[PDB]
Design a protein around this ligand. Sequence first.
Ligand code: CA
Length: 497
Amino acid sequence: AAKSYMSMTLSMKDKIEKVSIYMVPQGGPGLVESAEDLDFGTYYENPTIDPATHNAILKPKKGIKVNSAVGKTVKVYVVLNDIAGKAKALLANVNAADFDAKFKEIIELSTQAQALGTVADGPNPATAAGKIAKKNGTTDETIMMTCLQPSDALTIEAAVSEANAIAGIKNQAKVTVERSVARAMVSTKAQSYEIKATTQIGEIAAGSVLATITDIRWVVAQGERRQYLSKKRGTVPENTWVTPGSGFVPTSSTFHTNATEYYDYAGLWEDHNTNEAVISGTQVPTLADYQLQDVTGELANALSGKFLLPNTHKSGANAASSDYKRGNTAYVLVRAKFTPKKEAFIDRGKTYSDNTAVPEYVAGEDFFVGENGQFYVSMKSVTDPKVGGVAGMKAHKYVKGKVLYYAWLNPSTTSPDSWWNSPVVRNNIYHIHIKSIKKLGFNWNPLVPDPDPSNPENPNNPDPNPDEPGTPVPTDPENPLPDQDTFMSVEVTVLPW
Ligand SMILES: [Ca+2]
């Protein structure tokens, strides 16, 4: 039953499962006519490429029935792969007059509670972005897409045959769609790195090998948990496209109480391992692993990277004028095993004040790095002057040698201590390549909200504070992005997806 037919040419490996079309009459209050959750393979041909734009076109092969909208001037909006039902639910019973504004309103992918995981959620936590972006084995990917702007207006003519609509003779419009998530990818020059001392460390002279970093893994966190259904422009040059959390600029205290109102951390538990002797997270491929034809299984999942929801703030040229902070910006967390040479330990071969012998450092065990930069086998050593310790000195405990590094997804400018800004925008790929790991990282991750910040326990953080009270924190959520002295050498590439 149809007063007329219409169709939609769509423009952009991606699998398109579903298509939703919304015909919005112009001019004032009115009735939207929608055809939601159509089976893509029933209504469209397979994607093909155009020489000019070198982009994909999705050509209709079946007509869309029109009834209420016949004779009206409409604009057409499109959602592809609405697989969490979010667009359908947001747009239901929306008047034609309100539809354009509603199409740029917010959808919630993870609740505030869901934005934090625990150990029981690993190794495959539900993430905000994962709910609208799925990898189908190693074959292809199903990703939600929306149009940035609707079709040019057109008048739906009555009595147009399905054949003429499909052929584009009458009642055909054109829409461009873009993916609702961004992709993070990480690679590494080598799977191991040699660390040189830059000063005397125990018996290790400056310039000599201090340690080896092995078993490098990664996770991604602090993308958003909500998003504008389709991209929303800001009002100033410093932030082209705004996100629901753009206005949030944390302080040391408001980070813990308010960060989950905007950001997802469930992904920190991806590929988590409950054995603390083992490094948690996803493997990092070498550049060589991409050239490999026919990969295994868990290497395949690592190569294709991870999804996250957009996250932008007002950009600036310094700490004062940039609203990007460590507590509101998307980050890659790199985890690795740091194995120091036993000779690096200033307490080696010495005797404690209680006349017991200082034990030799055992590879893979905890070690402690004092405020003075020296290495100790225990807290007893750290504070005992007879073994090179210092009374009242604090130290960082590296739990079974676990070290942590941050990489920001879209550093600008580059390269070391001037990347003040890091916008993450949908339908882009952020490729972080590790060229080297240059020194000792951090022993825990303070960029995770702690529901009771007065104590070090935090079940929502796989890398909680292991240190005694009064120990300086490695970093703070209210800090700006750039590192005064780089822990990692990286090159970040951003390209259209
Ligand atoms: Ca706590």
